[PDB]
Symmetry: D2
């Protein structure tokens, strides 16, 4: 029996790698993906072999991540419950996509991951796994094992000889998520010095910085005049935005599994792109088209959040969003200053921003008022 494990290289997925061998007595193919977490994946790969993997694979997926997941999602203007830019949500589908690919390649009947039974990630990994390969089997150790505590796990790690040691965090090219630990108290401000991707505003440059982003057909293609690949462009904007401490949000969100959760996120580049896109949309999108698109954005967002990426509903909405986004061509000029991003200008080759006279407006008004007057009259 072979099991392809989504291995990140930490203590848990290492314990899980051992656990899978003892519990199933199968070969465990470890897979580590580079999506910008800031770790050297080749290390995790070698640690995977050391830990017992029969085969470890490491792939650089930054470009695929931004090009085929982050960008399509951004075109839709996806935002979960007012503030979440879905940094972790869009990454999972990519990983799962590879786990199943590798499994079909290695002749592995199952895949495994270390997401807990209480979170959203388990749903994301599995819904995409089953959607891509219905016959695939999934193993989620967190839902199957007996450990009754952190302590038991560390011990178990030593029993097997695995290197060992306030909040949990997930980091990739789009953002860094922080939650759990002291963050569980919604009334408690995140601890000083917690953020890693964005410099702290109180320490950000005293002078504003200006940045311009060019969009071609729904996707950002250049920064300050320099053409950049999708992954390179996201990186560039994280640097510029991070320096100014841009893209910080603190929210209590609704998980798909049923309960609320306190989350803190930093999305510098993505936050710049969010506003840059709308700034350009303000000149290139028709009024009614925009209004309809914005009322659908929330649904698309919850789809992505729940894990329905490789689902027909999301791909259907995607057809609408891409169609609208095809017109988003132009440039946004933004001003960054201590945690804040201010749009200060925008231009577009086909801006709709430049017919009728005074009388016309009066007729428009009369026709629009008709039903309200009949209403009042009837209420007589």
């Amino acid at each position: 029996m072979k099991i392809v494990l989504a291995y990140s290289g930490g203590l848990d997925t290492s314990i899980i790698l051992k656990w899978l061998k003892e519990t199933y007595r199968a070969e465990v193919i470890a897979f580590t993906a580079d999506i910008g977490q800031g770790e050297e994946v080749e290390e995790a790969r070698e640690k995977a072999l050391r830990t017992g993997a029969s085969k470890a694979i490491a792939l650089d997926l930054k470009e695929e991540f931004v090009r085929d997941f982050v960008f399509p999602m951004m075109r839709a203007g996806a935002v979960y419950e007012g503030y979440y830019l879905l940094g972790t949500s869009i990454a999972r589908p990519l990983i799962a996509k590879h786990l199943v690919r590798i499994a079909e390649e290695e002749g592995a009947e199952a895949i495994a991951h270390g997401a807990t039974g209480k979170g959203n990630d388990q749903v994301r990994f599995e819904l995409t796994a089953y959607a891509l390969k219905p016959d695939i089997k999934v193993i989620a150790p967190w839902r199957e094992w007996s450990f009754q505590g952190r302590k038991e796990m560390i011990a178990y790690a030593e029993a097997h000889g695995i290197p060992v040691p306030p909040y949990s965090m997930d980091a990739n090219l789009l953002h860094i998520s922080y939650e759990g630990g002291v963050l569980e108290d919604p009334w408690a401000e995140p601890p000083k010095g917690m953020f890693r991707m964005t410099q702290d505003p109180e320490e950000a440059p005293d002078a504003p910085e200006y940045v311009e982003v060019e969009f071609f057909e729904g996707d950002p293609v250049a920064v300050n005049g320099e053409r950049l690949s999708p992954a390179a462009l996201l990186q560039r904007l994280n640097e510029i935005g991070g320096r100014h401490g841009v893209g910080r949000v603190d929210i209590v969100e609704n998980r798909f599994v049923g309960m609320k959760s306190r989350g803190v996120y930093e999305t510098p580049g993505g936050t710049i792109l969010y506003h840059a896109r709308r700034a350009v949309e303000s000149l290139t999108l028709d009024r009614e088209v925009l209004h309809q698109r914005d009322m659908l954005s929330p649904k698309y967002a919850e789809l992505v959040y729940y894990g329905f990426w490789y689902a027909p509903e999301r791909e259907a909405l995607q057809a609408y969003f891409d169609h609208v986004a095809r017109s988003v061509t132009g440039v946004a000029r933004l001003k960054l200053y201590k945690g804040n991003v201010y749009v200060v200008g925008r231009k577009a080759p086909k801006s709709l921003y430049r017919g009728y006279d005074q009388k016309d407006a009066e007729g428009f008004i009369k026709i629009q008022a008709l039903r309200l007057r009949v209403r009042a009259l009837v209420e007589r």
Copy 2:
């Protein structure tokens, strides 16, 4: 004949007052409403009697404004095209309401306003008027007079003897709007020194300032532990937020009367209220209720923007929003720092934030995955 004129005490409404007497040779009742424009409305009222007003009326409407218009709208989470908090939009209905009432009290056959024939305001004034009194006669001088240019208009004023004097402004308790003139070029950053209600971010306190807002069944009832009437509360928050440069928006919006327009808005208190409300909602609203409310907010927003306040569709949606808002009770703790508003804490007496067995998750996932698996299998 009698004509009730929404008189703001400015050049144009003064010109309009003379134009009304000279043209219709009717009795002109001037009406100035104090909605927080920061003008000694009493001056306006005297200046009107001194401009030919057969009777001038001034009313302090700050409380009614915030209580009967701003709060119901905030309760719904109204945001036009992603950034506009509708500062000017919700104020017009209030004015037209009184215009019509006064007209009925003074036995006047018609009312008048000085909104131009190219804007949204004329629609807001007139839809309100027609909805409240279908038989009302409306006179919009900007659509009826021959004046071309202001050089001309200045002449006419100087003529009848009427005091005479970069962008246009509209101010009230909720915000200050800037548009036109130097603002018409979408690529041009607004001019240094334009903002009046907010302190320039760069000139804002070097130390962050925390503020708490208490909501009771949808509405803000206190700040930093001090109970404050609707108007006093918005005022208090404008002061606190203004000093930090909070609530600045720069957008190119879609007008109802035809095309696009570049607008700049500062809504310090409202911006704080927007984030505070959502912070309290994150603990008191059900997931599915929230996702539905947010998908309807945009529609409510354009209704307000277009001028459909006293309209059946808006009042119907209001029933949905008021129902949901009734549960929003708690306190939000926010951190203000150089133009930004950060939520750092929230609490609620009836918080839904805390029967959970992880294996249940797997069953949840399998059922959710079914339709996806069938789909893939059929794709064979």
Copy 3:
């Protein structure tokens, strides 16, 4: 230990009654509700005692059913996937509501039902049970026992002295549902003679029959001038509509558990009410209100279909629908002929059916066209 069992009197629930006694060594309190199934509930209540219940309860819940469940649902214009009037769906919450109440009165820690683990009803029963009493225990034998087929179940029943008597059925005052067996092949027309509540259209009266239905504030209060209570009103319309073969539907629907199912439904009275309601709405509801309402109806229908009746989302939407329905006052006149229902007339005290001239229309047109013209000019 006591268990409140939803006992319908058939073979399965009788077998379930025995099963629960032995399996849980619990005292079983049977509950049978009269919701218009057309059976003598008292005979079910007696059989329960014969079968072993420590107590048997039987209540006439037809009035509460139509008044507190069917009527509120109809006000919403609820239709699942274009045709399903939700006859079985809105009935389930009412049964469960009583199980929990009785359980509360008898000091029972659990409730049980005979819905299978493959369909929608189990979800409905339990979601309402959990929502009304969060700590109640539920027992669904179909998900807990291991019978390997009817054969074995008959034997089990015979063993306990439980009398043992092409498709499945569910009937109540709203409709009769048929599915399973012969009906599983979606390409096969239902067998002749299957329908019970409605006359075969080919056998309906050669003369059409006119009927008038009066609505007061969103609810039907009279038929042909005779004031009738909710339950009696549905009954009357079932008679009149049934005699003409009205209300027959044949569809393949999407289940909440994840698959597709072929269902046939007859809803004579409800189908007449559906068209009668819209007929009265056509004179009493505002255009924009109606359009917003119809776009929310489907969401509401799926909530009902899924089982989220006692859920905050459904209650919220209800506030909107009720607000709108309050204007539906008037009379609908329909013509019934061989399977079809034809609206033939309508009237209302506050009808909005019968303030501008031709010139006004041109202005309306010019303004609505502006954005379209700009778009075309930019396309050049």
Copy 4:
């Protein structure tokens, strides 16, 4: 000056042809389109010449009408206010599209139509005209001339040699609309013998007729195994459906010009297609996709009704609808009987109508119920 007139051949457009020549001192190019009104278009073309047209064009647009307007609309499941299949609405854009093309080829600066200044058609003609050719000049005689009565118009007609001859009618391949006159009283049943496209159910065959409709990729491509072009197919279904009196609707609709009107429509073929489509969709569309699609259909319907065909909103939604519709491939089997259309069967090559055990179902319920249980416990 050259004016391209939408010439129907009747009295008013003949009067208009003369009116235009003398009023604008221009030559008139008459355009008559055959869209299935059951008229001899060449007779209208020749009558135009006799009336003074400098050139008369007559085109058979039946295939284009159904292929490029009706089908796209049906693919979206478009239905206005519950019953209107938009028979007249989708035909208007097609007419105007040709008026603009002819004006362009003929060097005409303007186009003219005979729609009155108080209806919906004027908006449809002009919105598409301006959208396709922004600088085109539109002349609508009804909003411009001074005729003050029918009598004066007849005298004018006779003066110019134009031959002169209960409700009004509009007929094309999709339907026949009836409104005005005796039909203006919403409480009055339409007069006997009014219908023309459909036989009265009272006179329809005693034997029901089965009909099969094959859908390829969202569009109907065959009837009873016979491959038919769009127009030939709609025609065929009108014959079959008409013989059975199928597709009659009687509604009071909300006009775009702000008021209500009583309309009676017979859409035999379109009605069969409506149900046929949903029958095939019941096996080919995913649950979530269908639900989203049905919530957007009404919006698309109002767009078509108001006249926003060649508009960005409609084309953006169309991208969504066409995406979904692409999966609609299969055959629908319906039973026609005295006014009714019954779906009795459906099949599809990629039917999603054929993965979990009861245990899975329990986990699903538990998770789905969590938030509801938390809500209940909090309410205490």
